[PDB]
């Protein structure tokens with residue numbers, strides 16, 4: 001495992017150094033999106049929570065294709081505000097329920113250090 | 126019962142001699158984790174507090190699987206700091222609320238004497 005806690009204040013600095021395998025070592029789900037919501041990275045812990053295969057979702061659009069239940073003011077709306085403002089750091093609970101048993105999670109979206117990159121972190125609640 | 130008090134200054138020396146049955150005799154919950162948070166030992170008193178079955182949780186990851194509510198800077202963050210520094214001795218109250226009635230506890234994490242081992246002690250408050 002990689003010793004990083006969900007919600008940590010410097011998470012964007014710690015995860016900037018991680019390859020695919022290190023991201024797969026986290027205690028929580030980690031998704032990286034571009035500013036349009038296309039999936040750039042997606043770790044194994046996320047697949048443990050939602051059942052998706054981390055290899056197959058890369059390149060798909062999170063809001064349009066993978067996670068339409070997040071296409072709402074309360075999730076996508078917050079994401080796109082943060083993208084437009086160039087700052088994003090918001091945490092909230094949510095339920096993931098598309099083609100799956102409804103699963104309540106805590107979500108933390110935070111702008112990455114890489115250009116045009118935004119993290120979506122997920123854990124069970 | 127085993128005559129050891131929660132928070133005692135030499136608890137790591139006293140619990141080094143205990144088998145499963147002696148650990149099960151303590152007045153408080155006692156979990157032993159490796160440095161990644163995988164569960165090595167887990168006593169009966171802990172199961173009385175949180176409802177989990179001590180045999181089934183051995184080998185699971187505390188922060189990723191069993192106790193996601195502890196995957197936070199205030200619990201896991203402190204744990205991993207103590208692991209990285211090779212010293213850990215911290216006590217704090219916390220609420221355990223994953224798939225259970227929220228239960229307020231006092232937590233004491235302390236490095237064990239065994240290599241790559243860390244105690245998490247729990248009592249109700």
Ligand SMILES: *C(=O)/C=C/c1ccc(O)cc1
Pocket residue numbers: 046047050052066067068069070095096097098
């Ligand atoms: C709602 O449609 C949520 C879908 C979802 C969220 C997170 C994932 O890893 C996969 C699908």
Ligand SMILES: *C(=O)/C=C/c1ccc(O)cc1
Pocket residue numbers: 171172175177191192193194195220221222223
């Ligand atoms: C939060 O998710 C806490 C969970 C928990 C703590 C302690 C246990 O013995 C079992 C589950």
